[PDB]
Amino acid sequence: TTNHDHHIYVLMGVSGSGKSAVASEVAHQLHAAFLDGDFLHPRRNIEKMASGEPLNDDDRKPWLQALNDAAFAMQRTNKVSLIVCSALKKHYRDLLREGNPNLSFIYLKGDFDVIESRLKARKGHFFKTQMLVTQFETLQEPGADETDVLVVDIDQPLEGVVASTIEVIKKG
Amino acid sequence: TTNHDHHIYVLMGVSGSGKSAVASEVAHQLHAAFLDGDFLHPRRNIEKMASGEPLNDDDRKPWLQALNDAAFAMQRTNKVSLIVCSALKKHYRDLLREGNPNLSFIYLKGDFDVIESRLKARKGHFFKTQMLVTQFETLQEPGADETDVLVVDIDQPLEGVVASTIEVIKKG
Numbered sequence: 001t002t003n004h005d006h007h008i009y010v011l012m013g014v015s016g017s018g019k020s021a022v023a024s025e026v027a028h029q030l031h032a033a034f035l036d037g038d039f040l041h042p043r044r045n046i047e048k049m050a051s052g053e054p055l056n057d058d059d060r061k062p063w064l065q066a067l068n069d070a071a072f073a074m075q076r077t078n079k080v081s082l083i084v085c086s087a088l089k090k091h092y093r094d095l096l097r098e099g100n101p102n103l104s105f106i107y108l109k110g111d112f113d114v115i116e117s118r119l120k121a122r123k124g125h126f127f128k129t130q131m132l133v134t135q136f137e138t139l140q141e142p143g144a145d146e147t148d149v150l151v152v153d154i155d156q157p158l159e160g161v162v163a164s165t166i167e168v169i170k171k172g
Numbered sequence: 173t174t175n176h177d178h179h180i181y182v183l184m185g186v187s188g189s190g191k192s193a194v195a196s197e198v199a200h201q202l203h204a205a206f207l208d209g210d211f212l213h214p215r216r217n218i219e220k221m222a223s224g225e226p227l228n229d230d231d232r233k234p235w236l237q238a239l240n241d242a243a244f245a246m247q248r249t250n251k252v253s254l255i256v257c258s259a260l261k262k263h264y265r266d267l268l269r270e271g272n273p274n275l276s277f278i279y280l281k282g283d284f285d286v287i288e289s290r291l292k293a294r295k296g297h298f299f300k301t302q303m304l305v306t307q308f309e310t311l312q313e314p315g316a317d318e319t320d321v322l323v324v325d326i327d328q329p330l331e332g333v334v335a336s337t338i339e340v341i342k343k344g
């Protein structure tokens with residue numbers, strides 16, 4: 001049922017760290033399945049969000065379980081499946097891990113100043129520094145004790161992180 | 173909550189019509205959001221199918237309702253959203269339509285001989301005739317009364333199918 005020769009990689013990291021760009025390119029070049037985790041939020045969450053209220057860990061819980069389940073499905077028919085999910089808290093990672101031993105994470109790791117300039121570089125985008133601060137505040141970095149976590153250096157042009165991500169995926 | 177300025181396109185058609193190959197390349201070229209609808213099956217459907225049994229329409233309902241919420245979520249942040257779902261039965265399509273007035277279908281239309289040839293050209297694939305035959309039996313072509321349906325000619329090279337898809341997407 002779990003297909004141990006198929007693997008799932010959750011692209012994680014704070015907002016602006018490259019999750020969508022990297023994951024978009026990596027799936028293209030690898031012919032891999034690709035799911036953006038934001039699309040699994042229940043109707044409930046989309047409406048809360050539209051109304052400007054910020055989700056809570058109790059709201060994230062149903063979203064994450066659906067993420068879990070979608071990972072379970074993707075691994076039924078693809079050797080390599082990529083999911084985009086910031087996954088800031090260890091506890092979110094545990095919820096994704098459950099029942100998916102063939103799941104691992106690729107942490108797109110960068111420090112604050114690198115990500116900030118990358119967020120600023122978008123024409124017309126009004127940058128609120130506080131948004132990023134909190135991202136980093138919320139971030140619970142996966143340490144070495146989290147052994148299904150691979151880490152990729154973002155202080156690199158898009159092509160590099162894409163390559164490092166590929167290397168990380170192919171490394172076995 | 174319905175962003176009436178954003179749109180969702182459900183690429184549909186029988187097995188082998190090209191849904192995946194076309195949606196992939198098209199989302200790539202348009203930088204559109206993309207969801208393979210098979211990834212939204214509830215846990216139980218996956219197991220049921222893991223066990224070798226085919227889904228019945230009761231199984232499909234919650235699958236489709238979840239896909240519906242997924243389209244709902246996608247249109248929140250993407251101007252163009254692609255979803256792959258063969259959606260053969262009118263009923264499945266209504267399930268998708270509900271609460272999504274900004275959703276429409278893109279029918280990858282073509283006949284047996286053409287689809288057959290293509291499935292057969294898969295290297296290593298032992299073509300089983302009955303499969304495709306059942307697909308066509310099950311197909312309830314969207315007639316003119318389904319006004320949210322766009323049609324594309326599959327009897328054209330992939331990249332033309334792509335362009336024709338791109339053309340109907342940009343047509344408005």
Ligand SMILES: Nc1ncnc2c1ncn2[C@@H]1O[C@H](COP(=O)(O)OP(=O)(O)OP(=O)(O)O)[C@@H](O)[C@H]1O
Nearest residue numbers: 014015016017018019020021022118156157158161
């Ligand atoms: N390594 C890179 N080098 C230069 N620019 C990059 C790199 N990676 C991503 N970018 C750009 O920086 C911005 C942030 O990337 P992206 O949208 O993928 O981040 P994200 O992690 O998905 O953010 P969010 O989680 O908020 O949706 C984008 O404009 C993207 O084009």
Ligand SMILES: Nc1ncnc2c1ncn2[C@@H]1O[C@H](COP(=O)(O)OP(=O)(O)OP(=O)(O)O)[C@@H](O)[C@H]1O
Nearest residue numbers: 186187188189190191192193290326328329330333
């Ligand atoms: N118009 C095209 N011209 C030639 N070959 C095509 C064309 N479109 C798709 N193909 C090829 O035909 C095969 C069927 O395509 P594809 O896997 O995208 O169909 P599908 O609708 O997603 O089928 P399924 O629902 O079974 O996954 C693929 O191998 C694809 O590479």
Ligand SMILES: [Mg+2]
Nearest residue numbers: 018019020021
């Ligand atoms: Mg993103």
Ligand SMILES: [Mg+2]
Nearest residue numbers: 190191192193
């Ligand atoms: Mg397909």
